[PDB]
Structure 1
Amino acid sequence: RELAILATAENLLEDRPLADISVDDLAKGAGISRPTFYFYFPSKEAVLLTLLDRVVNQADMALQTLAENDRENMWRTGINVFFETFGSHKAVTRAGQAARATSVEVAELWSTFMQKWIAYTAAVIDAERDRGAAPRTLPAHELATALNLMNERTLFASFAGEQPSVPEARVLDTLVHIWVTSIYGE
């Protein structure tokens, strides 16, 4: 019944925003009363927080699976965790990013996982540098930061079909070229 509230919320986020979704909306959808809903979640806001948390941890688990196992393809594979994971959860992604402005727990969750993915990118760049494959150019953590923020903005513009945006079928190739040239280039 927790799963039913979450699934009902993911569905309703595909045809309208959170503001236009009532607790009763979520209650009916999971086939429970308004008050029974409140036993599982304090708000519709915490329902989005739980969805976002699950999408983010799926991405994070998938990037850990890669880390335990050519260079252009290694970066493609890692960028593709975020493309596939968030691209399969477009409504949660769109509503997650919107809720950063108004929910401190959404902003902190997003902030924590971004710190973690930048720290991972920076360790990979330093490892490529230590073994002589990439040149010592920018500080690794500053380059990591900017490449991760590029992906956030560019992936989410594409998913939401913003103008402007890279077409979704061209965004992976676009990002991989920019990562690989800026990491290996002089």
Structure 2
Amino acid sequence: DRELAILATAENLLEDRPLADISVDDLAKGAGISRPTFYFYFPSKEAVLLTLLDRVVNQADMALQTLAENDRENMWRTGINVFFETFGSHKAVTRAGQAARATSVEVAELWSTFMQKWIAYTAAVIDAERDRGAAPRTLPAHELATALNLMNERTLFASFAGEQPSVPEARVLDTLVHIWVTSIYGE
């Protein structure tokens, strides 16, 4: 399938260079198609990135939904790990998709919708923990959930991209889980 070959080529090329340094000819060439055939499937390379990002985000969303449908520290660690493993398996798409937020309304909306959904879920679990007496009623659950999920987005991204500063990738899950558990269950 030619559309899949375009997507595979784009992800492969994003490992080596940013989207600005990839041409439609590069994408068409790697996919084994002509430039006009490429434009049948996508109007631009930015549309290719949007489709790649949608597939990665959808993969994380489906894994989280699978977890949601089935100790306290391990509960949170298993969910945070979905983000760690899913986006960490597509670091080039993740990095390019984060950068495209500044210039693409569709990319920004894709990220925003996903984040709002799992912030709302986080808040609902915190509320449930408070209802059963396991967690104290401290901050508004939705505000706490927002900050913790923004921390995870920024901190996981830093670890993936090798940024300075960053938590080493091999330490970042423990670091985030500690902060989540102490801030959710601590007085």
Shift of 1:159: 0.1
TM-score for both structures, normalised by structure 1: 1.00
How far apart, in 1, do the equivalents of 2:56 and 2:184 lie? Answer: 28
Shift of 1:27: 0.2
Q: What per-residue deviation string (whole Å, max 9, x for no partner) do you get for residues 142-181 of structure 1?
A: 0000000000000000000000000000000000000000
Shift of 1:140: 0.2
Superposition misfits of 4+ residues, deviation over 6 angstroms: none
Shift of 1:112: 0.6
Shift of 1:47: 0.3
How far apart, in 2, do the equivalents of 1:98 and 1:67 lie? Answer: 30
Structure 1, unaligned stretches of length 5 or more? none
Q: What per-residue deviation string (whole Å, max 9, x for no partner) do you get for residues 67-107 of structure 1?
A: 01100000000000000000000000000000000001000
How far apart, in 2, do the equivalents of 1:157 and 1:123 lie? Answer: 27
Shift of 1:52: 0.4
User: C-alpha root-mean-square deviation of aligned residues, in Å?
Assistant: 0.4
SS at match of 1:112: helix
How far apart, in 1, do the equivalents of 2:161 and 2:43 lie? Answer: 28
SS at match of 1:15: coil
How far apart, in 2, do the equivalents of 1:68 and 1:178 lie? Answer: 25
Q: Which residue number in structure 2 is paired with residue 93 of structure 1?
A: 94
How far apart, in 1, do the equivalents of 2:186 and 2:113 lie? Answer: 29
Shift of 1:130: 0.6
How far apart, in 1, do the equivalents of 2:59 and 2:128 lie? Answer: 25
Shift of 1:63: 0.3
Shift of 1:65: 0.4
Query: Matched residue pairs, number?
Result: 186
TM-score for both structures, normalised by structure 2: 0.99
